[PDB]
Amino acid sequence: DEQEEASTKLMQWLRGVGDAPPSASMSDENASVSSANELIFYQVDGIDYAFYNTKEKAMLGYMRFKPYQKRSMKQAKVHPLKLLVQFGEFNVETLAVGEEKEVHSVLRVGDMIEIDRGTRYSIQNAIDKVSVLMCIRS
Amino acid sequence: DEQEEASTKLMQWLRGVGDAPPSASMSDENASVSSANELIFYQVDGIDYAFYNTKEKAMLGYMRFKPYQKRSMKQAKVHPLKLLVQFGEFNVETLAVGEEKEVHSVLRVGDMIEIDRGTRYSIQNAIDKVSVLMCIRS
C-alpha cells in the first residue's frame, strides 16, 4: 500500500490537488535520471506544463487543464508527438496534411493519439474537473 | 469520482489485478487513436509486454514485472529509449558507450531514466509486488 500511496500522491500533485512527492534516493543525481520531484509546472497562455529535464529539452512532459479549458490550435511542424491521457478526458480535433476534413476524437485515461508531422491539432478538456495529459515528442 | 474509478481500473489491469477497462467511444476506430482497450499483454522471456498500435510498431508500451523479477541485459542498439515508472519501484543498471563503470539507479513512480543509443541496461523489480514501467522508444 506504500506504493499505492506513492502513486496517489503523484497523481494528486499532477492534478494540482496535493503537495510535491517526497524524495527517496540519491539516484535523482544520476545524469540519465529525471525524477518526478524534478517536475515544476509553469503556465504558458493559460495551460500548465511540466517537462522532465531530458538531454533534448521539451521531449517528455505533462499538460494540466482547468475544467473545460481549451488549448488553441498548434501544428506538429517539426516533431510528431503522442498525447497520452493520464487523468480525466479530452476532446482532440486534428487536421492532417493533405486532408481537408477534420477528425474529432475523445480520449479517456490510458488512451493515446498520434499527431503526425504537419498535423494541426486542438485540445479541449472534456470534463468539469482538472484533466492531465502526457506529451511525448519525437 | 467517475474519472478516479476509470484511472483505478486502468492501473489494476496494468498490474494484472483487474479486468480490461470498458469501452467508451467510437474514437478508438480513428486512424491516429490507440485506446487503452487496444492493449494486450504478451509474455516474452518471462516479462509481460503490451504496446499501443502506433504507426511505427513497438514505440510505446508497458512492461509488467512479477515480484523481484529481473529483465536480462539489453542494448539500445538502434533506438534511445525512456523508461517511466507507472507503478512500484525498479533498480536499473546502465553502462554507457565509452564508459567502463556501471551506474545503478533506483526509480519510483513518475521517475524516468533515459537510455542513450549504445547503452547496455538491466532492470529488476525492486519490490515484492507487481511493478509496471512505460517504455518510450525514439
Author numbering:
A (entry chain A), B (entry chain A): 1274 to 1411
Original authors' sentences:
Centromeres are microtubule attachment sites on chromosomes defined by the enrichment of histone variant CENP‐A‐containing nucleosomes. To preserve centromere identity, CENP‐A must be escorted to centromeres by a CENP‐A‐specific chaperone for deposition. Instead, fly‐specific CAL1 appears to combine the roles of both HJURP and the Mis18 complex: pre‐nucleosomal CENP‐A recognition and its targeting to the centromere for deposition, respectively (Phansalkar et al, 2012). In this study, we present the structural basis for the recognition of CENP‐A/H4 and CENP‐C by CAL1.
Crystallisation trials carried out with CENP‐C1264–1411 alone and in complex with CAL1 produced diffraction quality crystals which diffracted X‐rays to about 1.8 and 2.3 Å, respectively. The twofold axis of the CENP‐C1264–1411 dimer was aligned with the crystallographic twofold axis. Consequently, just one molecule was present in the asymmetric unit. As expected, CENP‐C1264–1411 domain forms a cupin fold almost entirely made of β strands forming a β‐barrel with a helix preceding the cupin domain. The β strands assemble into two β sheets: a six‐stranded (β1‐β2‐β3‐β10‐β5‐β8) and a four‐stranded (β4‐β9‐β6‐β7). Dimerisation of CENP‐C cupin domain is mediated by a back‐to‐back arrangement of six‐stranded β‐sheets. In this arrangement, the loop connecting the N‐terminal α helix (α1) to β1 crosses over to its dimeric counterpart resulting in a “roof”‐like positioning of α‐helices on top of the β barrels. The surface area buried at the dimerisation interface is 1,706 Å2 which is about 50% of the total solvent accessible surface area. The interactions stabilising the dimerisation are predominantly hydrophobic involving residues L1283, W1286, L1287, L1312, L1314, Y1325, Y1335, M1407 and L1357. Structural comparison of dm and budding yeast CENP‐C cupin domains showed that although these domains share only weak similarity at the amino acid sequence level (21%), the overall fold conferring the β barrel structure is conserved.
